């Protein structure tokens, strides 16, 4: 099955009034039908009802439902991007950040105690200010972790080129890994330093013919500098005028020349950039991890408050009277969302009407087809009652 997330705890949010009855088991309440009428009896029911939030007229609820759905989609995309960055950081498993505890409390116990409690929102405040401030704080918290992850990726990309340029293969090598004066020129006015990469077979021929290949060259300068498994890298000291003739004559011998000049500041800056890139990548990784977790917790709390506000807005707009409805969060295990959605849709689908329900069960999340989307925002199908799917 690949129609939902099976690597985390899934939750189903349903809302109905105090006069509805299920169509799968008559003569039973919705509270006993939620736990007892569930598939297999493993559905955990938690308290999720909330009071009124100073909702105005019916004309403002239709405009507020689109902003609540867009803010819930943006908070759901930001929480999935922060959890995808935290899982992509190689610091947690595939099930972590989606089923683990948040703030020392579990997801079913924390979701059952979710009574519209926040540290920046109240029951007497408007829903538009908390819906805008939650999307703004989630967007800034996601943008900070995205900028920290981009800075850590740039620091790792610079640290890869600095570590590859520090030593290793002779294809891209710079003479900055040796501080001894015997491998370069020190206190010279006309001498320079040039590295020549030769093969293992022609190493003795390059050292024997390197002195007679270019005139006006320093003898005994050819030594063992570095080579991984295929070549030997030697240094050559001579005049700056004969460097082009020695490199052009060395290029005709089937050798690999390396352009370079005598300079200590280039090796000092080349060692300083690789020396600072690892500390910058480590500090950006630690700050990106702490800001990723701290933004992920507030993003999950803002997504839960946005879903709790959208469930009460859709339940208040759909049912009408009475203003107080019984809403709960059902914690379902993985691979059983189709039976809970089909049983809840067949049981509570008759409350909305007789023409709004559909006999299509499940969804399609393939790469070559995006049909059968269970939602009230598409024209392929709609929901027969107040119900939303949450895939963490």
């Amino acid at each position: 099955m690949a129609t939902a997330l099976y690597t985390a705890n899934d939750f189903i949010l349903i809302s109905l009034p105090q006069n509805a009855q299920p169509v799968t088991a008559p003569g039973s309440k919705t509270d006993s039908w939620f736990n007892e009428t569930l598939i297999g009896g493993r559905a955990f029911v938690s308290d999720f009802k909330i009071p009124e939030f100073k909702i105005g007229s019916l004309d403002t609820l239709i405009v507020e439902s689109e902003e609540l759905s867009k803010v819930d989609n943006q908070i759901g995309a930001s929480i999935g991007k922060i959890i995808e960055i935290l899982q992509g950081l190689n610091e947690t498993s595939t099930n972590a950040y989606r089923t683990l505890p948040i703030n020392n409390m579990p997801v079913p116990e924390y979701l059952e105690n979710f009574q519209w409690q926040t540290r920046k929102f109240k029951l007497d405040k408007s829903i538009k200010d908390l819906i805008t401030l939650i999307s703004n704080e989630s967007s800034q918290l996601d943008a900070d972790v995205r900028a920290t992850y981009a800075n850590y990726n740039s620091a790792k990309t610079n640290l890869a080129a600095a570590e590859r340029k520090k030593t290793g293969d002779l294809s891209v090598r710079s003479l900055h890994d040796i501080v001894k004066p015997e491998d370069f020129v020190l206190n010279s006015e006309h001498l320079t330093t040039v590295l020549v990469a030769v093969p293992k077979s022609l190493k003795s021929d390059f050292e024997k013919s390197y002195e007679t290949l270019s005139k006006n060259v320093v003898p005994a300068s050819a030594s063992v500098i570095a080579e991984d498994a295929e070549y030997v890298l030697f240094n050559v000291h001579l005049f700056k005028k004969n460097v082009q003739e020695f490199t052009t004559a060395a290029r005709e011998k089937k050798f690999i020349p390396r352009e370079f000049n005598y300079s200590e500041e280039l090796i000092d800056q080349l060692k300083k950039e690789h020396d600072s890139a690892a500390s910058l990548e480590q500090s950006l990784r630690v700050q990106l991890v702490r800001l990723a977790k701290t933004a992920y917790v507030d993003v999950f709390i803002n997504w839960f408050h946005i879903k709790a506000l959208r469930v009460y807005v859709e339940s208040v707009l759909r049912y009408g009277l009475p203003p107080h409805f019984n809403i709960k969060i059902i914690a379902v295990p993985p691979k059983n969302l189709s039976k809970c959605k089909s049983e809840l849709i067949d049981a509570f689908g008759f409350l909305g009407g007789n023409a709004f329900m559909k006999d299509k069960k499940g969804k399609i999340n393939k790469q070559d087809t995006s049909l059968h989307q269970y939602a009230s925002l598409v024209d392929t199908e709609y929901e027969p009652f107040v119900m939303y799917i949450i895939n963490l």
């Binding site: 399609i364 393939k366 070559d368 087809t369 049909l371 059968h372």
Partner: protein, 150 residues
């Protein structure tokens, strides 16, 4: 030549099994290729493979019916009508399965886009068994018109 009539009994089930296998493979290829685009009509699109695979029962029942009346020795009279009826039933089943494979693949690919073409694909696919039924009836009449067994 005694016992020469076994080639007609084996060739009907061989050609019918090969035509039913090629038709089931050709129908299953287009059904499996069309199932990725739209998995709602997979059960409706799976009818051509099962309908194409049932063509081997005519040659198997004809080979079992010809094998039930055969002993250990036979004359040269049965080994001329038997190979003709078995070759006709095998060629009819192989041609019906070969047409049912491309008809099932084209009917599944055409029925995958529009759901109204399933009745036309089932109606055009249902007419492919007339050649195997006519060859099985001609093989049954030619097998029933034989004698001098032993």
């Amino acid at each position: 030549a005694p016992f020469f009539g076994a080639i007609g009994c084996a060739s009907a089930i061989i050609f019918t099994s090969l035509g039913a296998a090629y038709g089931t493979a050709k129908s299953g290829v287009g059904i499996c290729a069309t199932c990725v685009l739209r998995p709602d009509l997979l059960f409706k699109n799976i009818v051509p493979v099962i309908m194409a695979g049932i063509i081997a029962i005519y040659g198997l029942v004809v080979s079992v019916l010809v094998c039930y009346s055969l002993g250990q020795k036979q004359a040269l009279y049965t080994g001329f009508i038997q190979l003709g009826a078995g070759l006709s039933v095998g060629l009819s089943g192989l041609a019906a399965g070969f047409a049912i494979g491309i008809v099932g693949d084209a009917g599944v690919r055409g029925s995958s886009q529009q759901p109204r073409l399933f009745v036309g694909m089932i109606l055009i696919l249902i007419f492919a068994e007339v050649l195997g039924l006519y060859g099985l009836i001609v093989a049954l009449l030619l097998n029933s018109r034989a004698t001098q067994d032993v």
